[PDB]
Amino acid sequence: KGSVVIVGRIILS
Amino acid sequence: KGSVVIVGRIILS
Amino acid sequence: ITAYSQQTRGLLGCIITSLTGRDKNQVEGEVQVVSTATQSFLATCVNGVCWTVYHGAGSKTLAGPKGPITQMYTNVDQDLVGWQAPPGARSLTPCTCGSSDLYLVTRHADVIPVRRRGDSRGSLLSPRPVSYLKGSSGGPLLCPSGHAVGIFRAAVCTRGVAKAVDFVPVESMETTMR
Amino acid sequence: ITAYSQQTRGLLGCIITSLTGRDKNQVEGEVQVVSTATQSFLATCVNGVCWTVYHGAGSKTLAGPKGPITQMYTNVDQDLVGWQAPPGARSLTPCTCGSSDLYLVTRHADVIPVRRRGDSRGSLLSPRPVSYLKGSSGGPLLCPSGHAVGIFRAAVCTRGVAKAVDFVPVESMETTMR
Ligand SMILES: [Zn+2]
Ligand SMILES: [Zn+2]
């Protein structure tokens, strides 16, 4: 089946 | 804009 | 009852099929999972017509085999909307049995038992969190036999917990079709 | 506490990566922004595991460096689903240390104050429309120390605006791991 896919990130600071 | 598309299904049993 | 999901398109096809309006695919099952550019919910075929909720579909057409299909119905106040069922489209038969023992078949093929608390509500015996239900409005509510008794409109939440739900009675869809 | 969103993919990337199921790019950051065909949401690593909400992911696999990662954990009743964290992920460490001062981080990167009002309850200071938290399900709730107290499930909203948040508490994620 189709997969979830990381599209970007939120970098904590 | 556009139409509502059937994206998948749920077969009952 | 039991049911299973089956993806039939990815983003690129939803897109293309959203702009050309023509769905060149075989419809199967009874409840389909549909999408727009900003939302995905369910739609089910009762009496040869694809019902869904107004807060999802709104007034858009349904991409179909010869081009987009126009709404056959539109009860904005009832939050109901419908399209004539395109070729095939297995259709659940109206209730008959008046069984408080309802069945909510969620958008991920999950079936969860619901106890009819009346004309248009049904309590969840096992009170799940409200978010579980996201993307499942429009889905069917059956009774042990596999008959359609409604369309999931909204979960009656309390402190983020979906204690019960609200469905359009199939009798009301019928009144419309009258 | 602060955050800055970083896009790493686009349509082609999601469409192909979601087909092959193999993501060559490298994970980085505590909270990644994931996406399927119909919806986009967030995922946050806590204790070396990619936790997310069941409504958004269902039972799909994550596209990974060596192919599709199967879900390691799946706690449907709490709308939770977690994958074994891929390399490059700076995992967060749990917390829940009596503090009632939380900070919800959204998918556009805005850290908003949530006063804990229970175990999975938390009123906001600054009310926003339900429209302001769409696509942030699966986000993390950070106490002042920068340690995760839970995963955001959905806004607790009253006819229009969002008042509180319902979250799966870190503790519950810990017990699900056992
Ligand atoms: Zn019946
Ligand atoms: Zn802390």
Q: Is D149 on the interface with A (CB under 8 A)?
A: no
Question: Which two three-digit tokens encode residue C16?
Answer: 């293309």
Whether C33 has its CB under 8 Å from any CB of chain B: the answer is yes
Q: Coil, strand, or helix at residue D146?
A: coil
Check: CB of residue C124 under 8 Å from CB of residue C112. Answer: yes
C1 in Cβ contact with C104 (< 8 Å): no
The greatest distance separating any two alpha carbons of chain B, rounded to the nearest whole angstrom, comes to 36
- Cβ pair D57, D65 in contact under 8 A: no
**Alpha-carbon span D84 to C49, nearest angstrom:** 43
Nearest CA-CA distance, residue A6 and chain D, Å: 4
The C-alpha atoms of residue D167 and residue D39 are separated, in whole angstroms, by 19
* Number of neighbours of residue D128 by Cβ within 10 angstroms: 16
Cβ neighbours of C9 in B, within 8 Å? 5-8
Count of other CB atoms within 10 angstroms of residue C90: 15
Q: D5-16: buried (b, 16+ CB within 10 Å) or exposed (e) per residue?
A: beebbeeebbbb
Element (H, E) at D176: helix D170-176
For residues C147 and C94, what is the distance between their CA atoms, to the nearest angstrom? 6
Nearest to D60 by CA among C104, C10, A5: A5
Residue C82 tokens read as 């419908």
DSSP string, D2-47: -EEEEE---HHHHHHHHHH----S---BSEEEEE-SS-EEEEEEBS
Tell me the technique behind this structure: X-ray
For residue C40 the two structure tokens come to 């995905």
The pocket of ion ligand 2, defined by CB under 5 A, consists of: D 95, 97, 143, 145, 147
**Nearest-angstrom CA–CA distance, D170 and D178:** 13
CA distance C158 to D156: 9
Q: How far is A4 from chain C (nearest CA, A)?
A: 11
Helix (H, G, I), strand (E, B) or coil at B5: strand
Both tokens of D50, joined, read: 């990619």
- Give the resolution value in Å: 2.8
Pairing of strands D121-129, D111-116: antiparallel
Contact partners, residue C69, CB within 8 Å, separation at least 6: C61, C62, C63, C83, C84, C86
Ligand 2 center to D173 CA (angstroms): 16
The rounded Cα D52 to chain-centroid distance in angstroms is 5
**For the residues of chain C, what is the DSSP string, one character each?**
--EEEEE---HHHHHHHHHH-B--S---SSEEEEE-SS-EEEEEEETTEEEEEHHHHTT--B-BSSSPBPPSEEETTTTEEEEEPPSS---BPB--S--SEEEEE-TTS-EEEEEE-SSSEEEESS--BGGGGTT-TT-EEEETTTEEEEEEEEEEEETTEEEEEEEEEHHHHHHHH-
Instruction: For residue C129, list chain D residues with Cβ-Cβ distance below 8 A.
Output: 78-79, 120, 153-154, 166, 168
Could you tell me the CA-to-CA distances from A8 to A11, D27, D30, D80, D110 in Å, in that order? Answer: 10, 9, 11, 21, 15
Q: Distance (Å, rounded) from C-alpha D150 to C-alpha D172?
A: 9
Active site residues of D: 55, 79, 137
User: What gap in Å lies between CA C163 and CA D175, rounded to an integer?
Assistant: 24
Q: How is domain D93-177 classified at the CATH fold level?
A: Thrombin, subunit H (2.40.10)
Tell me which chain C residue has its CA closest to the CA of residue A2: C10
Only one residue has tokens 């991920």, namely C108
Query: Is-same-fold flag (C5-92; C93-177)?
Result: yes
CA dist list (Å): D50 to A4, C115, D44, D122, D147: 12, 35, 6, 23, 15
Contact of D151 with D173, CB cutoff 8 Å: yes
CA distance D74 to D55: 12
Name chain A contacts of D2, Cβ cutoff 8 Å: 12-13
DSSP 3-state of D177: coil
Element (H, E) at D148: strand D148-158
Annotated binding-site residue? C95:
yes
Cα C24–C174–C34 angle (5° rounding)? 30
| Residue C31 Cα to chain centre, angstroms | 6
Compute how many other C-beta atoms are within 10 angstroms of the C-beta atom of residue C132: 26
Distance from CA of C73 to the nearest CA of D (A): 25
Catalytic residue among C18, C35, C40, C55, which? C55
Place of tokens 């990566």: D17
CA angle C56, C115, D75 (to 5 degrees): 70
E-strand stretches of chain B: 5-12
Strand partners for C75: C80
Q: Which chains touch B (3 or more CB pairs under 8 A)?
A: C
Shortest CB distance from D30 goes to which of A2, A3, A12? Answer: A12
Q: Does domain C5-92 sit in CATH 2.40.10.120?
A: yes
User: What is d(CA B6, CA C31) in angstroms, rounded to the nearest whole number?
Assistant: 10
A/C interface, count of CB pairs below 8 Å: 3
Tokens of C128: 């799940």
Q: What are the boundaries of each domain within chain D? A: 5-92, 93-177
Decide if D4 and A10 are in contact by the 8 Å CB cutoff.
yes
Is D156 close to C159, i.e. CB distance below 8 A?
Answer: yes
Its sign, for the CA torsion C113, C116, C122, C125, is negative
Backbone φ, ψ for residue C106 (5° rounding): -60, 165
Beta carbons of C126 and D77 less than 8 Å apart: yes
Residue D131 phi, psi (nearest 5): -65, -25
Report residue C130: phi and psi, to 5°.
Answer: -55, -35
CB contact under 8 A, B9 and C18: no
Q: Report the sign of the C-alpha dihedral through residues C86, C89, C94, C100, in that order.
A: negative
- Axis-axis angle for helices C11-20, D11-20 (nearest 10): 120
CA angle D44, D50, D54 (to 5 degrees): 90
Quick one: which of C123, C44, C56, C40 has its CA closest to D41? Answer: C40
Give buried/exposed letters for C21-43 (b at 16+ CB in 10 A, else e). bebeeebebbbbbbbbeebbbbb
What would the two tokens of residue D45 be? 């690593």
Written as one letter, the residue type at A5 is V
Backbone φ, ψ for residue C157 (5° rounding): -85, 165
- Are D37 and A2 within 8 A, CB to CB? yes
Q: Are strands C111-116 and C121-124 parallel, antiparallel or unpaired?
A: antiparallel
C126 in catalytic set: no
Which ligand lies nearest to the CA atom of residue D94 in the structure?
2
Pairing assessment for the beta strands D49-52 and C101-105 based on DSSP bridges: unpaired
